[PDB]
Amino acid sequence: EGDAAAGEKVSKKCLACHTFDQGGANKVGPNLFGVFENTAAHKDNYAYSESYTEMKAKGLTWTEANLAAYVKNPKAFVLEKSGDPKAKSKMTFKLTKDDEIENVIAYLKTLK
Numbered sequence: 001e002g003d004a005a006a007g008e009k010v011s012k013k014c015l016a017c018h019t020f021d022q023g024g025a026n027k028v029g030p031n032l033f034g035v036f037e038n039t040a041a042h043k044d045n046y047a048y049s050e051s052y053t054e055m056k057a058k059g060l061t062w063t064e065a066n067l068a069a070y071v072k073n074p075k076a077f078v079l080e081k082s083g084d085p086k087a088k089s090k091m092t093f094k095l096t097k098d099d100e101i102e103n104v105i106a107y108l109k110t111l112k
């Protein structure tokens with residue numbers, strides 16, 4: 001689902017905190033090239049909130065459906081999927097429009 005060309009547009013909403021290119025810098029949040037189908041806490045050089053390390057132990061991978069639920073409300077996400085009530089997220093920013101989420105995901109799928 002999802003037009004990865006409208007997705008690239010929406011993605012401009014993430015660029016204050018993230019980069020997209022291969023080898024890219026960790027600005028505020030980790031670079032997101034390669035994120036699709038990859039583990040939670042997927043970048044080794046970024047210091048993630050403990051809650052992402054605990055999704056990653058569980059074997060959570062960034063599927064279409066877990067990116068969908070995440071980018072709707074990261075903080076509810078990380079509580080939910082970690083099982084740790086004291087779960088923190090530094091993200092905070094959410095997408096609320098369904099078309100947007102679907103399109104953004106379709107454009108994450110083209111970055112490896």
Ligand code: HEM
Nearest residue numbers: 013014017028029030040041042043048049089090091093
């Ligand atoms: C639609 C726009 C964005 C998308 C697609 C995006 C996607 C994601 C993804 C998939 C992760 C987790 C990667 C991992 O588990 O390895 C993440 C982490 C994070 N994002 Fe974003 N994000 C977006 C916008 C933002 C913006 C606007 C901010 C800052 C205001 C930001 C800050 C962060 C931070 C700080 C983390 C790490 C969280 C922590 O360890 O607590 N993100 N992002």
